[PDB]
Tab-separated table of all heavy atoms in Angstrom:
chain	number	residue	atom	x	y	z
A	30	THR	N	58.815	136.526	93.059
A	30	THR	CA	58.029	137.608	92.474
A	30	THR	C	57.985	137.469	90.957
A	30	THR	O	58.840	136.830	90.338
A	30	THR	CB	58.589	139.000	92.825
A	30	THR	OG1	59.724	139.287	92.001
A	30	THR	CG2	59.005	139.102	94.285
A	31	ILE	N	56.969	138.101	90.372
A	31	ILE	CA	56.831	138.262	88.933
A	31	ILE	C	56.880	139.761	88.668
A	31	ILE	O	56.873	140.571	89.593
A	31	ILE	CB	55.514	137.671	88.387
A	31	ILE	CG1	55.003	136.540	89.263
A	31	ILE	CG2	55.706	137.105	86.984
A	31	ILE	CD1	53.562	136.184	88.956
A	32	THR	N	56.949	140.133	87.392
A	32	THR	CA	56.809	141.522	86.965
A	32	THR	C	55.814	141.585	85.813
A	32	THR	O	56.124	141.162	84.695
A	32	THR	CB	58.157	142.103	86.556
A	32	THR	OG1	58.890	141.125	85.811
A	32	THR	CG2	58.962	142.508	87.783
A	33	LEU	N	54.626	142.112	86.076
A	33	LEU	CA	53.624	142.311	85.042
A	33	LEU	C	53.528	143.770	84.623
A	33	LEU	O	53.957	144.682	85.333
A	33	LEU	CB	52.230	141.863	85.474
A	33	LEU	CG	51.854	140.405	85.562
A	33	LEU	CD1	50.416	140.408	85.984
A	33	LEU	CD2	51.996	139.764	84.200
A	34	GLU	N	52.964	143.963	83.439
A	34	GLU	CA	52.527	145.260	82.942
A	34	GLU	C	51.003	145.244	82.839
A	34	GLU	O	50.423	144.408	82.137
A	34	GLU	CB	53.204	145.596	81.605
A	34	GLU	CG	53.069	144.580	80.441
A	34	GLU	CD	53.950	143.355	80.598
A	34	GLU	OE1	54.963	143.449	81.319
A	34	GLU	OE2	53.607	142.291	80.042
A	35	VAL	N	50.350	146.114	83.604
A	35	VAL	CA	48.896	146.208	83.611
A	35	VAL	C	48.502	147.673	83.580
A	35	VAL	O	49.328	148.569	83.733
A	35	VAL	CB	48.245	145.539	84.842
A	35	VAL	CG1	48.534	144.039	84.909
A	35	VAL	CG2	48.678	146.243	86.109
A	36	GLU	N	47.223	147.896	83.395
A	36	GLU	CA	46.616	149.191	83.595
A	36	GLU	C	45.794	149.153	84.875
A	36	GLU	O	45.345	148.083	85.290
A	36	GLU	CB	45.715	149.615	82.424
A	36	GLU	CG	46.428	149.859	81.093
A	36	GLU	CD	46.884	148.588	80.399
A	36	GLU	OE1	46.328	147.512	80.704
A	36	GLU	OE2	47.796	148.667	79.551
A	37	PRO	N	45.620	150.290	85.554
A	37	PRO	CA	44.688	150.316	86.691
A	37	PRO	C	43.243	150.083	86.287
A	37	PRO	O	42.416	149.723	87.136
A	37	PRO	CB	44.896	151.711	87.286
A	37	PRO	CG	46.250	152.120	86.823
A	37	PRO	CD	46.409	151.531	85.463
A	38	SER	N	42.910	150.295	85.015
A	38	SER	CA	41.588	149.999	84.489
A	38	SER	C	41.416	148.535	84.097
A	38	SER	O	40.305	148.144	83.719
A	38	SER	CB	41.289	150.904	83.290
A	38	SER	OG	41.782	150.344	82.086
A	39	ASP	N	42.475	147.728	84.173
A	39	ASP	CA	42.372	146.308	83.860
A	39	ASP	C	41.500	145.592	84.882
A	39	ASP	O	41.465	145.962	86.058
A	39	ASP	CB	43.757	145.667	83.832
A	39	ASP	CG	44.322	145.557	82.437
A	39	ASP	OD1	43.690	146.068	81.488
A	39	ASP	OD2	45.396	144.945	82.290
A	40	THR	N	40.773	144.577	84.427
A	40	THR	CA	40.044	143.755	85.374
A	40	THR	C	41.025	142.845	86.101
A	40	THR	O	42.172	142.673	85.685
A	40	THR	CB	38.976	142.908	84.679
A	40	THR	OG1	39.555	141.668	84.259
A	40	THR	CG2	38.427	143.633	83.458
A	41	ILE	N	40.573	142.284	87.222
A	41	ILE	CA	41.378	141.283	87.913
A	41	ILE	C	41.525	140.037	87.046
A	41	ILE	O	42.609	139.446	86.963
A	41	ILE	CB	40.771	140.980	89.296
A	41	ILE	CG1	40.873	142.218	90.194
A	41	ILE	CG2	41.440	139.797	89.961
A	41	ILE	CD1	42.284	142.751	90.359
A	42	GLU	N	40.455	139.660	86.339
A	42	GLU	CA	40.523	138.547	85.395
A	42	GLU	C	41.442	138.865	84.219
A	42	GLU	O	42.054	137.957	83.641
A	42	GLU	CB	39.118	138.190	84.907
A	43	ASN	N	41.514	140.144	83.826
A	43	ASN	CA	42.523	140.587	82.865
A	43	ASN	C	43.925	140.378	83.431
A	43	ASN	O	44.834	139.941	82.716
A	43	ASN	CB	42.281	142.060	82.501
A	43	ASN	CG	43.040	142.518	81.258
A	43	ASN	OD1	44.047	141.940	80.849
A	43	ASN	ND2	42.543	143.588	80.645
A	44	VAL	N	44.117	140.680	84.715
A	44	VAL	CA	45.392	140.373	85.353
A	44	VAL	C	45.549	138.863	85.524
A	44	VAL	O	46.641	138.315	85.329
A	44	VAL	CB	45.511	141.130	86.688
A	44	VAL	CG1	46.843	140.853	87.364
A	44	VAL	CG2	45.350	142.612	86.458
A	45	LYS	N	44.452	138.165	85.861
A	45	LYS	CA	44.490	136.706	85.969
A	45	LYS	C	44.742	136.040	84.624
A	45	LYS	O	45.236	134.907	84.572
A	45	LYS	CB	43.199	136.164	86.581
A	45	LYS	CG	43.044	136.431	88.052
A	45	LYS	CD	41.880	135.648	88.605
A	45	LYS	CE	41.897	135.678	90.118
A	45	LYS	NZ	40.746	134.933	90.710
A	46	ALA	N	44.374	136.703	83.527
A	46	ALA	CA	44.791	136.210	82.222
A	46	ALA	C	46.300	136.331	82.047
A	46	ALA	O	46.935	135.426	81.496
A	46	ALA	CB	44.057	136.962	81.114
A	47	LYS	N	46.893	137.424	82.546
A	47	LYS	CA	48.316	137.680	82.329
A	47	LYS	C	49.191	136.724	83.127
A	47	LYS	O	50.290	136.371	82.685
A	47	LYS	CB	48.644	139.129	82.680
A	47	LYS	CG	47.966	140.116	81.766
A	47	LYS	CD	48.162	141.537	82.215
A	47	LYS	CE	47.309	142.477	81.385
A	47	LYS	NZ	47.820	142.650	79.999
A	48	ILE	N	48.732	136.323	84.315
A	48	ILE	CA	49.424	135.292	85.083
A	48	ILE	C	49.391	133.965	84.340
A	48	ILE	O	50.401	133.252	84.262
A	48	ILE	CB	48.790	135.156	86.476
A	48	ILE	CG1	48.770	136.507	87.181
A	48	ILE	CG2	49.554	134.121	87.306
A	48	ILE	CD1	50.139	137.052	87.399
A	49	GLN	N	48.225	133.618	83.789
A	49	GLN	CA	48.068	132.372	83.045
A	49	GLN	C	48.925	132.363	81.786
A	49	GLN	O	49.459	131.320	81.397
A	49	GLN	CB	46.595	132.172	82.690
A	49	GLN	CG	46.283	130.841	82.045
A	49	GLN	CD	44.816	130.691	81.738
A	49	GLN	OE1	44.115	131.680	81.537
A	49	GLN	NE2	44.339	129.453	81.697
A	50	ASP	N	49.062	133.516	81.127
A	50	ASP	CA	49.997	133.615	80.009
A	50	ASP	C	51.439	133.434	80.472
A	50	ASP	O	52.288	132.956	79.711
A	50	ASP	CB	49.822	134.952	79.277
A	50	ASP	CG	48.430	135.130	78.711
A	50	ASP	OD1	47.929	134.191	78.058
A	50	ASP	OD2	47.838	136.207	78.918
A	51	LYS	N	51.728	133.808	81.715
A	51	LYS	CA	53.068	133.661	82.255
A	51	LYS	C	53.266	132.356	83.015
A	51	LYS	O	54.408	131.959	83.237
A	51	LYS	CB	53.421	134.853	83.145
A	51	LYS	CG	53.536	136.137	82.362
A	51	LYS	CD	54.402	137.153	83.067
A	51	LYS	CE	55.861	136.782	82.923
A	51	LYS	NZ	56.735	137.967	82.974
A	52	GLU	N	52.200	131.710	83.495
A	52	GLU	CA	52.361	130.463	84.234
A	52	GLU	C	51.508	129.288	83.789
A	52	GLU	O	51.682	128.202	84.343
A	52	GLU	CB	52.060	130.662	85.718
A	52	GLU	CG	53.284	130.808	86.593
A	52	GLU	CD	53.952	129.484	86.991
A	52	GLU	OE1	53.770	128.458	86.315
A	52	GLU	OE2	54.633	129.464	88.033
A	53	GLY	N	50.519	129.476	82.917
A	53	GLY	CA	49.632	128.374	82.596
A	53	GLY	C	48.630	128.027	83.679
A	53	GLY	O	47.852	127.093	83.495
A	54	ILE	N	48.640	128.731	84.804
A	54	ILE	CA	47.770	128.407	85.931
A	54	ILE	C	46.418	129.001	85.643
A	54	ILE	O	46.312	130.164	85.247
A	54	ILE	CB	48.375	128.897	87.260
A	54	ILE	CG1	47.547	128.372	88.437
A	54	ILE	CG2	48.664	130.416	87.296
A	54	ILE	CD1	47.694	126.900	88.710
A	55	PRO	N	45.331	128.199	85.683
A	55	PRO	CA	44.043	128.703	85.233
A	55	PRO	C	43.503	129.725	86.183
A	55	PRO	O	43.760	129.682	87.409
A	55	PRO	CB	43.174	127.432	85.192
A	55	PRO	CG	44.162	126.324	85.005
A	55	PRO	CD	45.337	126.741	85.823
A	56	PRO	N	42.761	130.732	85.669
A	56	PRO	CA	42.322	131.868	86.495
A	56	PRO	C	41.343	131.495	87.591
A	56	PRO	O	41.233	132.221	88.592
A	56	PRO	CB	41.671	132.810	85.473
A	56	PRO	CG	42.259	132.422	84.176
A	56	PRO	CD	42.418	130.939	84.246
A	57	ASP	N	40.621	130.384	87.431
A	57	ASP	CA	39.670	129.939	88.437
A	57	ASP	C	40.340	129.464	89.720
A	57	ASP	O	39.700	129.491	90.776
A	57	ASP	CB	38.796	128.822	87.851
A	57	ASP	CG	39.609	127.743	87.147
A	57	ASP	OD1	40.833	127.695	87.340
A	57	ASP	OD2	39.028	126.937	86.396
C-alpha cells in the first residue's frame, strides 16, 4: 500500500500525478 493526500475534487490524473511523484511510473 501507499498513503496519499488528495482532495475529493482532485482529478484522477491529479492523483496519477501524485503516484508518479511517488513512483516515477508514468500516468498513461
Side-chain angles (χ1 to χ4, degrees), residues 30-41 43-57:
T30 78
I31 333 166
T32 41
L33 285 181
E34 55 284 337
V35 298
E36 294 74 21
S38 87
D39 263 5
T40 88
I41 294 304
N43 195 338
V44 181
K45 288 190 168 179
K47 295 173 188 287
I48 305 298
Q49 186 179 27
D50 300 312
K51 293 203 76 152
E52 260 278 22
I54 188 72
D57 48 15

